[PDB]
């Protein structure tokens, strides 16, 4: 509400409570210390959204035993449709030299077979590397998202063409810190989050985020600040590498990542952010992009508890996320793959609707809107009497999102 950024800082208060919604997603690496169906259930309850499998080490048989476990734990909560949370799987290729080695070709092939939701591609140096990965996945894996790991000086120098070729970006700070002067990594990180924010592409901040929590149940002051600063810069997700894989306190690390992220999302200077994104937004005759910027403006003005968006490809939810609302974006979808991929975008809380398609199309749209009202009350994002923004289209199918209603919570 402050007019300067300096006044905004000065007004920050450690007594003012945060909101119940977390906006930043959480990717955890699954290793030895978290592979168990019991430990996984606890991390899904602690707010893990994305289970990452590292194909540096292990056979295909070890990894397929990890994928079974992740899915078993996930489907354990499937009985209550209101409380179910979809969990994505991510494959992280070893990488290199050629863009795709012989090992990677078999791994990527195994990924399509095991039905992963995304691929983190290692050692991306140019757009033609991303085209090589996309070809190997084929037509069977055409709906798999490719996140390019930036890891060297040439990858940084040619960032713009890689971002145009990708589905999103991973600032992989470990390797980036080996191949450039460690004092410069913070600059590369901010440049890349800036540019991904402007394109509307998801950026993941990774590596040595909670490093001291491998051995001790509490982070250092630096680690608390680091996670919070990635969140304030505009990272879409944050990653836990060794902390979840090999350390002694997997759940504590996930719980610490949850707490920091809510707190830092309450320190964002949204008025300057929403403004700056708009003065950069191209005017077009696209209804969907107009409905979305309308919805974000409305939500500020009435301080809505949520933006509800009905989505098949997730595209309509991605566009709202682009404008960085303060309310959580509840995306309702019948497509299980769409619901898992949604975790990459800041703000989107996906909910998977299981109810069958009613004969009357307007009855079917009402069912899904109420479903999303139930989830929001259950999870405590809003209470009966609050105001929500619902976003829908004028006919069935993708690409027709045109309507925006301001409704009282039933």
């Amino acid at each position: 509400m402050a007019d300067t950024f300096l006044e905004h800082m000065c007004r920050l208060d450690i007594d003012s409570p945060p909101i119940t919604a977390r906006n930043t997603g959480i990717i955890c690496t699954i290793g030895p210390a978290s592979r168990s169906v019991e430990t996984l259930k606890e991390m899904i309850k602690s707010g893990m959204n994305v289970a990452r499998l590292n194909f540096s080490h292990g056979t295909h048989e070890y990894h397929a035993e990890t994928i079974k476990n992740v899915r078993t734990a996930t489907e354990s909560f499937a009985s209550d449709p209101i409380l179910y949370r979809p969990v994505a799987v991510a494959l992280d290729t070893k990488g290199p030299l050629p863009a795709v080695s012989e090992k990677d070709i078999q791994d990527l092939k195994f990924g399509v077979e095991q039905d992963v939701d995304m691929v983190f591609a290692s050692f991306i140096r140019k757009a033609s590397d991303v085209h090589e990965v996309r070809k190997v996945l084929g037509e069977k894996g055409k709906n798999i998202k490719i996140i390019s790991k930036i890891e060297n000086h040439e990858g940084v120098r040619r960032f713009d063409e890689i971002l145009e070729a990708s589905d999103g970006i991973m600032v992989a700070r470990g390797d980036l810190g080996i191949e450039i002067p460690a004092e410069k990594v913070f600059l590369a990180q901010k440049m890349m989050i800036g540019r991904c924010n402007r394109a509307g592409k998801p950026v993941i901040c990774a590596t040595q985020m909670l490093e001291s929590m491998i051995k001790k149940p509490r982070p250092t002051r630096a680690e608390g600040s680091d996670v919070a600063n990635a969140v304030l810069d505009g990272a879409d997700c944050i990653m836990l590498s060794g902390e979840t894989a090999k350390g002694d306190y997997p759940l504590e690390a996930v719980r610490m990542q949850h707490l920091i992220a809510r707190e830092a999302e309450a320190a964002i200077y949204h008025l300057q952010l929403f403004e700056e994104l708009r003065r950069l937004a191209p005017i077009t005759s696209d209804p969907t992009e107009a409905t979305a910027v309308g919805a974000v403006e409305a939500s500020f003005k009435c301080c809505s508890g949520a933006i509800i968006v009905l989505t098949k490809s997730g595209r309509s939810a991605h566009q709202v996320a682009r404008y960085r609302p303060r309310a959580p974006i509840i995306a309702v979808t019948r497509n299980p793959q769409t619901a898992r991929q949604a975790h990459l975008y800041r703000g989107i809380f996906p909910v998977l609707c299981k109810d069958p398609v009613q004969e009357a199309w307007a009855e079917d749209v009402d069912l899904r809107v109420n479903f999303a009202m139930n989830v929001g009350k259950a999870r405590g994002f809003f209470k009966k009497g609050d105001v929500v923004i619902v976003l829908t289209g004028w006919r069935p199918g993708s690409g027709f999102t045109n309507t925006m209603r301001v409704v009282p919570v039933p």
Copy 2:
């Protein structure tokens, strides 16, 4: 589209054509040289919205002969519902001393009987003067709008309480220029338009706007600049006093006021304006105020040709007007008094729907939306294939406006 106001000026081009819609309303005084049913038809075609009757001079019988003429000319175009334009009548009291003299009490009483749409109240010095006028009008005239003429130093000094008590304001520069130093009038004018803009109340700029056009068919360079500068400041309507009443060129004066106003509406620096109005807009749980700010933001982003708003009391249209969109605001209403009062607010092009109320309420809402698509094509504000913003409510009656759809022109 420029980032500074200085760059915005520098980019202005005399070769770039204006839009077909005029946003600033036109009030003309009816005198001897414009009282005729033939001259009136020509001024309605030239874009007169409000016919003002000056109760300084003339009997009640002379004035009732003016009102008959205004209405006859108006109803002559009533055969084509698409082309009909509603025309308001305004009563301008003589005024004073007491707030309401004996003459004014009879005049205001005559106004209620003759069914005027608004009253310009002379010599308003304090809020309790506006309360006196409101009492005299009674309950029979409770829906008549009271516009307070500011005309002296005490009226200026106590502006804020008068604006809170009024339905809108008239900067009456003639008398204001007699009672304060003429070099200060420009300051008082800007202060008052600033403050009325911020409250969302209509302000009228009046007196000696096209003074040289009483005798000559062309204005001076100063007069062209004056009308344009009132428009750029944010006046809702402009007034022609002697030029339409007594001069030789009534139609030329109306036609000159039309041309200047379109041109100056294309020089507004809308990005700074819309921004500044929002940072001053109180957050509330009012759906209507959220739907409206959503609609204005959407309309910028898709450069829509029009905002269509369905309105009974006109209230929903007043709220969109508050945010100063660049598109014309087509307000569709079945209430003839609402359609005439709408001329006071910047941007609102009212259209009066005559078609009977269909049994199905959604069919009835569709009828009025198509009606407003027909008027916009006919008048040339948009063509089939263009994008419009339609604004409607979720149930019948006032105060329920909640929906905003981005639609292709049928």
Copy 3:
């Protein structure tokens, strides 16, 4: 002091008194009704800075009789060095076809002989017209300023190259209003003042400013607004054509132009202006441009009564004027031609020092600074105890202005 432009308007007050300094210069046309040595004395006291001679009509002998009169009236006040005001002469060519007709060649030649301070060149259509005028003036008139009158659509279309070729610009609204649609003139005027402000070139706003004051001792409301709006746009000088030449009230017109201009200079939104000029100012290693922007920033922060600048070519004073300070700019110079040309730039109050050059150069700089303190007290711009910004160089000669001192008034 307000953060928005809307808040700035709303805060304007007709009871808050203006400052004693006028910032906008005044050019008056000398005709039959103002040619007399007695009437001229009265206009110099009323605040005429520039006497313009129209070479449309009259012989060389009639005009040389005007120049004698202007100079006699001027030199009458020369006895008191503190109160003396320098008065420029301007020649306005008839113009056309070729850039310079045969008549113009003789007139321009007569101008160099009679030692005019500037030339208003009529019907400038392209940069090569300004080069033709510059060649005719020769080397004897190389220090004469050429102000290009814009008067047609091609002159407007090619504005940028003319401004690069000129010493300043005159928006000649009369002819510009004949050759383009009168409703567009206000746009051309603002474009040109925008662009001259950004280049740091003087722009004059001319023609039909106080047109009703030819016959009546009081302006219309439109005329009061027009002069004020040119001042608010950023015109450097304003012009009186027929009002001073042929009308009944020459002194009243000059006195009205004085009053309006002080009042409108107190409504400028200086914080946005100074900001926007800086973000457009190229960084360079030029000391003079750094000393000047330093001085304008200092003057805001201490609300100084004046910027004193010692100047030979006037160049140092032109650079301060570029940043549009709120304090008057007292330019002290020993060069009589520099002191007359200074009237073209907004803010500069020139003072001509007559005292002989002291042997010690620092004693000579102190003499001129005290001289400028005396003039400021005498004219009432500041009183003993107030804070002023003094601007000087490190060695004698042009181009060395480097020092900026904040001093108490002695």
Copy 4:
């Protein structure tokens, strides 16, 4: 140079080299692993400005042996006046209950005797605690700076009155993280740096900044980001606790703190910063505050290599520092205590002039200005031909700084 903060981020480049000047000061704790006269020399060369002694542990005799060592190492470089760097000593009280325990009274008394430059006061909960410390120091220690360590929830809640009572602030994150939820520490840190920036008071960011560098010669990615983020927030100094006291790599830690800080000072968005500080700066008739804001504006416009400021109490240098210039601020002083205290303020590079006071006061001012030109060339902040801003007063003694000259480097 970018117009948004988002564009500014996007333009950041890891190939663009930083400037030679560091702006953020470095405080190192002296413990067992850095107490030696040989190790100290190496840390002074690596860019240690402030040697902090922790009075938690050790006798008075152990500490007085540390103070001797620090001063011996410092005075070893005193032979070359151009290369000498002044080094401050800081006493950090154990603290508590009463504001000052019995131990603290003896320690503070020992501090005055040993002639320390500042005191870090532990467990400050209210303004009256700072008054207690100030009384104990007496009149013998009246020129010692009191930095209040904030360390609990009541210290945070009553921040404003403590800041008004203090000479500066230390965000002590270790203890602050024990007494409030660790996820909130980042918020408290930013609030406090915001508020100290606005008051113009030095803020120190402390504790677990390079924690992994106790055992390993390289920081984690989080630690690189943490130091950089404190610098970007607007911390004046950064602190190394255990890393310099007990760890294996004292010099590597100091060298890493140097590198990160130059790099992060090249990512500041100075245009928004300088703007926001000015719109918050009170207008006053104080010459010094006007000369200072003038100097910072000039330095941006000519991209000066340095601001040279001649200072006795350091006050004139503190005021320039307040506006956060991009150039280093070379403060020239004959007062050794002033030169050591200057390390607390962001940007000030103090230089201690040893040359005797010349008879002619202007010759004496020229001597010190040239001295500061020599140091800047020697250290590589600028080269002959570059432009510098020199700041001086009109007479001898404190409080008279009024002049600002833009000069070529001799």
